[PDB]
Amino acid sequence: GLVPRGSHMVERLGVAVVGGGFMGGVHAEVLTADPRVDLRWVVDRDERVGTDLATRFGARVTTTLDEALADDTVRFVVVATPAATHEPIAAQVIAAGRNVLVEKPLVLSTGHARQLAAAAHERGVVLAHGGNFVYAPKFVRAHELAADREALGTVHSVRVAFRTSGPDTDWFRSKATAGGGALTDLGWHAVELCRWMLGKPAIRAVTACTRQLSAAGDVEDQGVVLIEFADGAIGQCDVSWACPGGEQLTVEVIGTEGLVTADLWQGMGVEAYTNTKFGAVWEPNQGWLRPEWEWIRNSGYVHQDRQVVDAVLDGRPMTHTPDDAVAVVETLEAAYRSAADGRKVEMNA
Amino acid sequence: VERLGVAVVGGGFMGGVHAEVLTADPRVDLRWVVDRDERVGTDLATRFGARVTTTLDEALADDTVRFVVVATPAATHEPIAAQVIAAGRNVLVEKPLVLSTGHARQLAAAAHERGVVLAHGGNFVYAPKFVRAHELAADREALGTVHSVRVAFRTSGPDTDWFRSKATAGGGALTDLGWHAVELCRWMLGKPAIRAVTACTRQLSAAGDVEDQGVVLIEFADGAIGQCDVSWACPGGEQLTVEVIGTEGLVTADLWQGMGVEAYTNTKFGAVWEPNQGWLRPEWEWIRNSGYVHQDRQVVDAVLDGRPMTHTPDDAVAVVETLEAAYRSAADGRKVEMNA
Amino acid sequence: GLVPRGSHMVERLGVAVVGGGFMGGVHAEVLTADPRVDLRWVVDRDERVGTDLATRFGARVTTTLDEALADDTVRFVVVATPAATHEPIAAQVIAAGRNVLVEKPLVLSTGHARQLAAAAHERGVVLAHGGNFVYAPKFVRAHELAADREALGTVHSVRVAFRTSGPDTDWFRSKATAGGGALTDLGWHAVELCRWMLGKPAIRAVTACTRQLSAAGDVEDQGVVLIEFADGAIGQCDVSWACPGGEQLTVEVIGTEGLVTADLWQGMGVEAYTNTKFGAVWEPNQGWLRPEWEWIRNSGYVHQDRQVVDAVLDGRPMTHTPDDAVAVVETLEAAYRSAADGRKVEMNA
Amino acid sequence: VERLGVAVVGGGFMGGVHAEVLTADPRVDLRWVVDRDERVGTDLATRFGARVTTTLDEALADDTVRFVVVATPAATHEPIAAQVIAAGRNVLVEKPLVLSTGHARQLAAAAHERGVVLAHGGNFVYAPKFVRAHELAADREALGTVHSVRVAFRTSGPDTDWFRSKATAGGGALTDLGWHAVELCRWMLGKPAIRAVTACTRQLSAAGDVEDQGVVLIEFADGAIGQCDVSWACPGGEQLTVEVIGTEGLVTADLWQGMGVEAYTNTKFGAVWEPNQGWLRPEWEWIRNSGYVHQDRQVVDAVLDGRPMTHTPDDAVAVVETLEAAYRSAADGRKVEMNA
Ligand SMILES: NC(=O)c1ccc[n+]([C@@H]2O[C@H](COP(=O)([O-])OP(=O)(O)OC[C@H]3O[C@@H](n4cnc5c(N)ncnc54)[C@H](O)[C@@H]3O)[C@@H](O)[C@H]2O)c1
Ligand SMILES: NC(=O)c1ccc[n+]([C@@H]2O[C@H](COP(=O)([O-])OP(=O)(O)OC[C@H]3O[C@@H](n4cnc5c(N)ncnc54)[C@H](O)[C@@H]3O)[C@@H](O)[C@H]2O)c1
Numbered sequence A, C: 001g002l003v004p005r006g007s008h009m010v011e012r013l014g015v016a017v018v019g020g021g022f023m024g025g026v027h028a029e030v031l032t033a034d035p036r037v038d039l040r041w042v043v044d045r046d047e048r049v050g051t052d053l054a055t056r057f058g059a060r061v062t063t064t065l066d067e068a069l070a071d072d073t074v075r076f077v078v079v080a081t082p083a084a085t086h087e088p089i090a091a092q093v094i095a096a097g098r099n100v101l102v103e104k105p106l107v108l109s110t111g112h113a114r115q116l117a118a119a120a121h122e123r124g125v126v127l128a129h130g131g132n133f134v135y136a137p138k139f140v141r142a143h144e145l146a147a148d149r150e151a152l153g154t155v156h157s158v159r160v161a162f163r164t165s166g167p168d169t170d171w172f173r174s175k176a177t178a179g180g181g182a183l184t185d186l187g188w189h190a191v192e193l194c195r196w197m198l199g200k201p202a203i204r205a206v207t208a209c210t211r212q213l214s215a216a217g218d219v220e221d222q223g224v225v226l227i228e229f230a231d232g233a234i235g236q237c238d239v240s241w242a243c244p245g246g247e248q249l250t251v252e253v254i255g256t257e258g259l260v261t262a263d264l265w266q267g268m269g270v271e272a273y274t275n276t277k278f279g280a281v282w283e284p285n286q287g288w289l290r291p292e293w294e295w296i297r298n299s300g301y302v303h304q305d306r307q308v309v310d311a312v313l314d315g316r317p318m319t320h321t322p323d324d325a326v327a328v329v330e331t332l333e334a335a336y337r338s339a340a341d342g343r344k345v346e347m348n349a
Numbered sequence B, D: 001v002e003r004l005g006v007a008v009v010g011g012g013f014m015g016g017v018h019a020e021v022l023t024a025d026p027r028v029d030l031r032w033v034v035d036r037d038e039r040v041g042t043d044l045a046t047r048f049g050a051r052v053t054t055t056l057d058e059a060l061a062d063d064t065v066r067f068v069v070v071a072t073p074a075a076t077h078e079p080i081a082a083q084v085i086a087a088g089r090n091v092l093v094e095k096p097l098v099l100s101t102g103h104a105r106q107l108a109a110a111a112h113e114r115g116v117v118l119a120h121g122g123n124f125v126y127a128p129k130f131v132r133a134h135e136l137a138a139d140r141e142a143l144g145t146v147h148s149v150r151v152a153f154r155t156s157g158p159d160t161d162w163f164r165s166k167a168t169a170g171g172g173a174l175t176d177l178g179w180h181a182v183e184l185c186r187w188m189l190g191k192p193a194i195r196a197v198t199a200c201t202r203q204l205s206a207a208g209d210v211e212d213q214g215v216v217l218i219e220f221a222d223g224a225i226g227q228c229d230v231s232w233a234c235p236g237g238e239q240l241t242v243e244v245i246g247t248e249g250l251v252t253a254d255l256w257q258g259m260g261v262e263a264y265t266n267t268k269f270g271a272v273w274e275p276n277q278g279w280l281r282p283e284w285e286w287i288r289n290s291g292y293v294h295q296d297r298q299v300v301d302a303v304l305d306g307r308p309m310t311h312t313p314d315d316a317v318a319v320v321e322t323l324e325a326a327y328r329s330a331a332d333g334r335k336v337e338m339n340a
């Protein structure tokens, strides 16, 4: 083998999805493919958007989180709303005694993260966060090779590059609603991947640089973080919202005896060219392309959500815990401080 | 919730893979392993909690068994499959379905008459990456007129002895690897009829009496040319690539070198298929990525829900004929016309 | 090292170029960069084209081959005219006692090739042919590794693929003027590369398939040749005029212990993307590109012409001789016969 | 036809390369090899038919010598170059030109006053592939606003001992490799001014007292961010890549992994730099492709034909300052502002 045994048709878990936008849709599609899941509610401030998602999966639609929480069959809530709404919404879901999966970034301050985590534990519920790429099949494989100590020797370098042409919806570009720019949006993943590839060691210091390119908004479009891990390995996170030509996500680990690299979007092994356009391909879809296949599964969403559901229904302890989210949140806060005053920031947390 | 009782015949490498794939299906109950070698069958049975026997009829006496996977040497396929169908069971037969076109048509007809599912083990037409490439290649506006398809399949050759005997394998690389190459070529073009086949083969190793490499040029009805390039003599790692070229566009897909992970070591990687020293391109999820999971899900779906199959015994017959024509072409040094 | 010593400024060789089209221009540019070369004449039936090339290099222009041959300073003639004109023109250049470089394909029949070669030898002049890719730096390197017998073991497979979107000028698509289509135009190179990569062994048999896609003309757009070499290795030449997206040229050699591959146009190590267009790039020049650098030198034209000039001026014997051209010509003639009647053709020549 | 008399100082690895490159130039007469080790200098001299000495002044007493290549350890560069310029000779000094910004400005000024050519050994800005990438990256309509440049330069480290001594090398990887990284970054953007530099370094090996790896973030005047990533601790083969990203486009170039030749062997390739087992990506024409040939042709052109140089001592000063600022940043844990 080995093929993981298939879910498991038979338990029933009532689910609410809060935020029926892009990511709420992905989760709705991933969760409804799981035989154990009953999607009961879509919650959204925009009723048209909420309604469109709900009818697609035969859920009920509401604009009030409290209506869904009044449904006793709901035991699990997915929160995919703008970043600054995560903490109030997750705090209320937890207080109502429900399990909750919160999209990246968990919250926007170290305090909120520690306190949300303490509140979930007290309430005896699962708090899970949406760092999907550490569940991506390709990266899991690469993580396994990066852990071969005989093969790599002493690891000294890790690098994660994550580049897009930027967000589609407006809330991403305001601090008030988003917390920060590319460093928050993409840097979340890059920092989680870096830690993880190294075996989650303590971070000793951080250095960072950011720029805002776009006139719209008040957040950065690009950032580079230099992370100093406790063993002395240097991490780099290179993120950007101003990169054309298609999403890029790569991971590189370098030791004294070996190295491991992995490429998500440019490593799918399919190539195409056309003089006109490919209908079934994400724009840009003319000229030379490297088309994706199974983008949802290959980004890790399917494995993440299966393991979250396994944690709620079967008490199967998760690989990635609120401790990991807390570590990411303080790294990002340290990075923003470093960028602001042009100095290395010592960690301690 | 719908349980399906399954028996696996042949407890070797492929029986092992199928057993792994089917027992991951919540609908499936693996009840029997059948194998002529009792030690091999016992090992597989104890691993998956099934009964074991050396006699297929002991497993067919079990009325719970409604579906049988046949993963035995090529020449044993037809007698076994005929038996299974005669006993009213649905069957999946590993590639080379059969060695003769007459036998293929009989089995299909016998299966249709009995009202059972006959399925064949061409797993790579179910591989997720190839399935995506096939979708792109079907965009007529994007590709214009399709005039070339090429499938290269290269390995360092089989390890068990019966593969290199003509009596039991029915062929060498052209059969073992060519089955897939031809099925992929055909499929990438939307499955058009084949009009002619030219082929060249060669035996390299001294062991056995079958070819180690071969090339087939295929003339499809519309005039597009297919190339199938297969070999048991290629070092450095398995290769499987697909290429479709039209006047306005093209599509390529690479299975084993397009998996997007690179590694280097001065020593070795323990978790990697040898060669595991120096520069490597390691696989991940090789069973799923090769198409076995999707194949076996769609065959179980057919048996349970009557949901009609994408790849049919008609496809398998087309492949058998082509391989028959290719071996004749290789012997006669001439293009062979397909009156079928 | 090692860097080849630089030409050698000082000898003077008067040159005529016949055919001032695309390839006559390339040669004019390569030859005038050689300090030893004096480009005296451009000969072309079209005076405007001839004149445009000549003024660019300060040559004289004529429409009569005889005018250039009346110039005693001319000792070396480059023939870059349509394929069917090669034999008469080269026969006249040779008879006038001049050295001659004839573009691919040398001539269109085995007889003509043997007889042209015999005539040059009798006249004591160099006859050279324009198979440039066997001089391409990258392929020379690959040829050297393919000759490591310990590293490859027994070589059993060689493959050359050569694909373009087809010729620009009309004469290429008529048998009368061109001899044949892609199999002649591209197959010339593919067959020469195959032989060479294997150490130029005898060819025992040939099998071939061709199709005509285009309505214009009467020659084939695609062809595949299966070559059986004497040692038992199988060669493949895959050529096409109907391939979009940019020129492709690759070489693959496979043995029992190893393999060697090389990629000319997709192996240049430069990548680019733009949302608009790159001005300095060969169309298609939008979207994802793999731009060439030094395309003339990297295709081998510079090394070929330097070695041809070395042969004339310094008697330095050439690596690739008229014997090699004769072998290619009969392979192609065998291939066309095989395609015509659907049978393997045994060689003997 | 115009002959230029040359002396090479330092008969080691780089002196060897330069001697190879310059003697291929028909305009050049290599007359002297100078080296403190007589055996090393003698070996190089006998190979190229030059005179040999251990005393630079014996070679400067020769009035035929109009041009000197200095390929000695970093700390020896300034005293030697000063001597050569003081004697009225044109000079080419290998990378790290000098270790101090003051010294760089003196040499440039001394050279300008004497009326001679001072050139520095940044060969990769002359590499044909990078020169092409630089042309693409200069297409403003195609790239839009340029906001990122990244240069990664990775090796398994130097083999001679003086490289790992601060006294004689003036630095580790950040100096040895970083010189190129910074010069490439700067050049790819059209050579704008540098406003600030942040850096992090680390020593891995126990031997020596210099860093093995370092990263530099560079803030250019317009606001574009440069990254220079260098390391002596990277296995599997040398890497050198360049990346430029703008809002409308991007350009990347790969020197050692973008050479387009792939090989595999179960044994080894004799004609290949080790690692020469397993999967390889072999180099071809490494001297020319690294830029040495073009560099040395353009320096000889300058000396003979007064044809002004693309890369000037002003560029070298900019690089020296940046490296100075980077090492301070690495020590202080802070961004260093460039008031130059
Ligand atoms: N892990 C990933 O790969 C990934 C990818 C994209 C986005 N995200 C994250 O998911 C979350 C949502 O992102 P998105 O792309 O789906 O945004 P989106 O703008 O597409 O959707 C946001 C939705 O939330 C609704 N909404 C706003 N406030 C609400 C509220 N108080 N209550 C209920 N609904 C509300 C909005 O009407 C909208 O429908 C973000 O936190 C984002 O960072 C994660
Ligand atoms: N689709 C694929 O990717 C793929 C890959 C490998 C093999 N196959 C095919 O699967 C089939 C088996 O190949 P394999 O690699 O597993 O071979 P194998 O030698 O590993 O196993 C074959 C097993 O069948 C047993 N056996 C032999 N004759 C039998 C008989 N009459 N009745 C019952 N059992 C018998 C043998 O003891 C043996 O254990 C072949 O047809 C092969 O072509 C397909």
Ligand SMILES: NC(=O)c1ccc[n+]([C@@H]2O[C@H](COP(=O)([O-])OP(=O)(O)OC[C@H]3O[C@@H](n4cnc5c(N)ncnc54)[C@H](O)[C@@H]3O)[C@@H](O)[C@H]2O)c1
Pocket: C018, C019, C020, C021, C022, C023, C024, C043, C044, C045, C046, C049, C079, C080, C081, C082, C083, C085, C103, C104, C105, C130, C131, C132, C169, C171, C185
């Ligand atoms: N080795 C290579 O890489 C390569 C590439 C392209 C073409 N070629 C070959 O070079 C030759 C010319 O090809 P091209 O692309 O330059 O064609 P072209 O059509 O661009 O140029 C042909 C030129 O020859 C002129 N011409 C025709 N008949 C003439 C005659 N009797 N006397 C003098 N001039 C005459 C024409 O006016 C025209 O200027 C062909 O044989 C071709 O196969 C080789």
Ligand SMILES: NC(=O)c1ccc[n+]([C@@H]2O[C@H](COP(=O)([O-])OP(=O)(O)OC[C@H]3O[C@@H](n4cnc5c(N)ncnc54)[C@H](O)[C@@H]3O)[C@@H](O)[C@H]2O)c1
Pocket: D009, D010, D011, D012, D013, D014, D015, D034, D035, D036, D037, D040, D070, D071, D072, D073, D074, D076, D094, D095, D096, D121, D122, D123, D160, D176
């Ligand atoms: N541009 C490049 O790609 C590149 C590559 C390697 C080295 N370099 C540089 O070239 C220079 C030499 O490096 P190397 O690898 O050739 O070192 P090396 O140790 O191989 O050779 C240095 C030589 O200089 C001799 N020498 C030492 N002190 C001397 C002195 N005072 N006077 C005369 N000779 C003296 C030594 O005997 C030695 O033979 C260094 O500055 C290095 O940074 C540049």
